[PDB]
Design an enzyme around this catalytic site. Sequence first.
Site, PDB file in Angstrom:
ATOM      1  N   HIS A 189       3.378  -0.482  -3.048  1.00  0.00           N
ATOM      2  CA  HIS A 189       3.203   0.785  -2.976  1.00  0.00           C
ATOM      3  C   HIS A 189       5.103   1.180  -3.050  1.00  0.00           C
ATOM      4  O   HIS A 189       5.884   0.521  -3.047  1.00  0.00           O
ATOM      5  CB  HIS A 189       2.900   1.326  -1.775  1.00  0.00           C
TER       6      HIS A 189
ATOM      7  N   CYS B 153       3.146  -4.551   3.325  1.00  0.00           N
ATOM      8  CA  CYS B 153       2.868  -4.282   2.237  1.00  0.00           C
ATOM      9  C   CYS B 153       4.222  -4.921   1.760  1.00  0.00           C
ATOM     10  O   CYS B 153       5.459  -5.180   1.948  1.00  0.00           O
ATOM     11  CB  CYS B 153       3.224  -3.373   2.527  1.00  0.00           C
TER      12      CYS B 153
HETATM   13  C1  LIG Z   1       0.796  -0.685   3.682  1.00  0.00           C
HETATM   14  C2  LIG Z   1       2.208  -1.224   4.513  1.00  0.00           C
HETATM   15  C3  LIG Z   1       2.041  -2.339   5.454  1.00  0.00           C
HETATM   16  O1  LIG Z   1       2.472  -3.104   6.061  1.00  0.00           O
HETATM   17  N1  LIG Z   1       0.469  -2.629   5.803  1.00  0.00           N
HETATM   18  C4  LIG Z   1      -0.142  -3.971   6.685  1.00  0.00           C
HETATM   19  C5  LIG Z   1      -1.173  -3.995   6.960  1.00  0.00           C
HETATM   20  C6  LIG Z   1      -1.454  -4.164   7.531  1.00  0.00           C
HETATM   21  S1  LIG Z   1      -2.786  -4.462   9.171  1.00  0.00           S
HETATM   22  C7  LIG Z   1      -3.873  -3.912   9.440  1.00  0.00           C
HETATM   23  O2  LIG Z   1      -1.277  -3.814  10.847  1.00  0.00           O
HETATM   24  O3  LIG Z   1      -2.162  -6.235  10.435  1.00  0.00           O
HETATM   25  C8  LIG Z   1      -1.381  -6.271   7.694  1.00  0.00           C
HETATM   26  C9  LIG Z   1      -0.720  -6.761   6.467  1.00  0.00           C
HETATM   27  C10 LIG Z   1       0.059  -5.184   5.716  1.00  0.00           C
HETATM   28  F1  LIG Z   1       0.875  -5.514   4.418  1.00  0.00           F
HETATM   29  C11 LIG Z   1      -0.762  -2.089   4.485  1.00  0.00           C
HETATM   30  O4  LIG Z   1      -1.272  -1.360   4.485  1.00  0.00           O
END
Ligand SMILES: *[C@@H]1CC(=O)N(c2cc(S(C)(=O)=O)ccc2F)C1=O
Length: 353
Positions: A282, A300
């Site tokens: 993103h 992400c």
């Molecule tokens: C995009 C931004 C980010 O860092 N994530 C993300 C969140 C998680 S979680 C649900 O907090 O464990 C795991 C992996 C990810 F890439 C996004 O959604």
Amino acid sequence: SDLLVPKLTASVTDGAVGVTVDAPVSVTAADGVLAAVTMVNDNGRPVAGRLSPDGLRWSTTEQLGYNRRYTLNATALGLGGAATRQLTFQTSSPAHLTMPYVMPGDGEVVGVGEPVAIRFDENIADRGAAEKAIKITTNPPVEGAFYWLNNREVRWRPEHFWKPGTAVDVAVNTYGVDLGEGMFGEDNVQTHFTIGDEVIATADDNTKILTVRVNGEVVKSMPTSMGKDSTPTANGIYIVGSRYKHIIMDSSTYGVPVNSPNGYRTDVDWATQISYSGVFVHSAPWSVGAQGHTNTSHGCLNVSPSNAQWFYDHVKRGDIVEVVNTVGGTLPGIDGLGDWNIPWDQWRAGNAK
Ligand SMILES: *[C@@H]1CC(=O)N(c2cc(S(C)(=O)=O)ccc2F)C1=O
Ligand SMILES: [Cl-]
Ligand SMILES: [Cl-]
Ligand SMILES: [Cl-]
Ligand SMILES: [Cl-]
Ligand code: NA
Ligand code: NA
């Protein structure tokens, strides 16, 4: 020559119960032709049928219903007399129904990593029957196998990525099929898709660069910032999923309260899903200074708005993202988009139980 007598043969037996509706009902004449064939349900409504031109075969031309008592009358005439039979039978009465959903969509063009997906809306107690009822055709033909990600969704892929130009045809013939514990298919599904260009994007934590390759040629090099040590991006193979011009990331969708130290709720642009667990490519204006240098996210792949939109524009469902050399482990094979991280010998062996 003495009087030969016509005979009748039906695909159901008089007084039968639990007849499955996954096949048409037919009547066949021997030593004679069919003069009249009718089939009505318990309410007296006729069932659509078609008599063959030679008059030897009558078959139902419409789908038969569950929990129905059908009555069948057939008259065969011949040079030496006639013969008539009346047959009544009762079809399956499911305890519960289940509707399948197939991805990718009919007519879609997808990348070399897209598996066939069949998702049911209920738990499947007899996976073997489900697999037997799903016929996959590939051109050029390639070996593949079934593997279940959870109790409701099964996947089918070959050992290696698809060859571009491969045609895939999926026929989920679950109607009238006992899928276990009185769970019968609510309908059939027929999907067809095609494999497009090879697009493989590699994110190397050593360089912090996301390199996109089309047909083997480097076409874009994106400075990126991935997951920090405490919440790292997992190495492995990711399958590109849906795409969003903008989307509100909300940690509560995974059970992590927004009002937590590790929660979050933010709106982001040009987001491309690559893992069910929430890994996206993103736009991250807040980390351009970190992109290509240090990791700062929850997993992400942060990139610039220009590169984020580019990824959104030039990458399609089924394309592949590979992360390597991160401090994290490997992406789970049953994540939803991590099918390729399961070693082929385990996938091939399946888990029909
Ligand atoms: C995009 C931004 C980010 O860092 N994530 C993300 C969140 C998680 S979680 C649900 O907090 O464990 C795991 C992996 C990810 F890439 C996004 O959604
Ligand atoms: Cl008829
Ligand atoms: Cl649903
Ligand atoms: Cl760090
Ligand atoms: Cl979300
Ligand atoms: Na005789
Ligand atoms: Na965030």
